[PDB]
Curated annotation (Swiss-Prot):
Record note on quaternary structure: Monomer. Homodimer. Part of a complex with DAXX, MDM2, RASSF1 and USP7. Part of a complex with DAXX, MDM2 and USP7. Interacts with MDM2; the interaction is independent of p53/TP53. Interacts with DAXX; the interaction is direct and independent of MDM2 and p53/TP53. Component of a complex composed of KMT2E/MLL5 (isoform 3), OGT (isoform 1) and USP7; the complex stabilizes KMT2E/MLL5, preventing KMT2E/MLL5 ubiquitination and proteasomal-mediated degradation. Interacts (via MATH domain) with KMT2E/MLL5 isoform 3. Interacts with OGT isoform 1.
Organism per entry: Homo sapiens (Human)
Protein name (Swiss-Prot/TrEMBL): Ubiquitin carboxyl-terminal hydrolase 7
Full-protein interval shown: 560 to 1083 of 1102
Gene, per the UniProt record: USP7
Cross-link Glycyl lysine isopeptide (Lys-Gly) (interchain with G-Cter in ubiquitin) placement: K315
Positions of post-translational N6-acetyllysine modification: K315
Recorded family membership: Belongs to the peptidase C19 family.
Species lineage: Eukaryota, Metazoa, Chordata, Craniata, Vertebrata
Amino acid sequence: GPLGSEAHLYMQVQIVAEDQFCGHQGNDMYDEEKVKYTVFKVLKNSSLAEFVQSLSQTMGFPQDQIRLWPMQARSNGTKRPAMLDNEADGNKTMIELSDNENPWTIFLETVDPELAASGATLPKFDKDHDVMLFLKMYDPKTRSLNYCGHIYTPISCKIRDLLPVMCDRAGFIQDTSLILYEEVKPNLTERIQDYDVSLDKALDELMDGDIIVFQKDDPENDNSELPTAKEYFRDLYHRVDVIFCDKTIPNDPGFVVTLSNRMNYFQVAKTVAQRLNTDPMLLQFFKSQGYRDGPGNPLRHNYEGTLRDLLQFFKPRQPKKLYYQQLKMKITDFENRRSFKCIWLNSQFREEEITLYPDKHGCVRDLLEECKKAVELGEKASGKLRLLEIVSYKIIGVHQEDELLECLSPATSRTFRIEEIPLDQVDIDNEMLVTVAHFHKEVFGTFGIPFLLRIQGEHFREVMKRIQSLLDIQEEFEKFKFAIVMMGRHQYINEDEYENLKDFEPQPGMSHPRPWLGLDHFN
């Protein structure tokens, strides 16, 4: 194996009986992915007469009461039965007749099995003057199609004379006034405007396997969501069933919404929001892909495409799915959130990487409150926040809350830090806030965590043990060395005699950068 040497000699012929046409709700006779066939494996080079007897035997029919109407495609994409003459074209072989279709599907017509016991012959059909039409009846109250079989008619027959047949097969009195459409193709259902015309003239390109759709003309109809068959099919044509899965709870079965191709975002949203009981603005949707099954870029409200546009990357036989999430705030605010990566300095003096989402048009205060929402602030402490800007492990700034977040540096050397203010740094007057920074170095080899301090002049040895309880370094804090650092210069200060002032400030002669206390030691 697997494939056998003589396999190429063979083609496949899918026979489809008229019962498959019943209850079909779409265009043409049946849906291709539901229809039940009788499949034959026939020899490519074999003949029609051969296949017909073989068929006859298998199906349980005499040959003089079946006729085969090959299902043939048309330019407009529809598929309908077509005439094939079982006698003229019988000498010919199956691939020839098939036009190399593999598989080939054929409509097997049969005698009404009631008149079949009687031994009834299938009616004579003139290839040139008769047509085989198919009838469908459209019922407004139930939005459904009900198959009405087929008829042989001369093409000279005035349409008016088909009315009684149509009524009798639907289930109507003869007085019943009908509306007749031709189903031409999907999204084209054409009302026959005038019944006192021959079929030949009534319908353009009249041929076998053409479809007349008829309905009752009763004022009752106007109550239906879809009064005419024309509306039924136009609705059908744009109908699409979409699966909405939540992008936050994976292995979500999701659910199926029936929507329309034509709908816009507000309409799609309004519809999904309903059977979620939540607001459409409390929903965010995601642009979609197709086959690498997964939520793409957040589709955004200002969006103005149609649902057809959102599913344009889908294969037709592939089931349709869109991802969404549920929102805690208005949709229109969620999009104006800014991703803001910074450092949270807890009250254990240790650094945590946190990403906060304040509003784009927000200010520093706004960022601070977003931070307080994510952190415990150490009991009985101050519980007040400030934002620092840090570079090379040195604090270069403290930003006012009223300052717009927009004004802050995108730069990646800049590191923003949020911390709560120690209790002894909120009231101030004979006392100052100074920047402190660790180091090895001459003056630029800075490292570790900088911080703000508590500089009037007094005991320096006490300042040191305060920094000691804060750095919480057990004693390797001996062999530290401490320095004031200003513009182009740094004077040291031993741990013995020093008592300071406001040496820290620009000696009169530019306002920034300010000096800093620096802590000299290893790693």
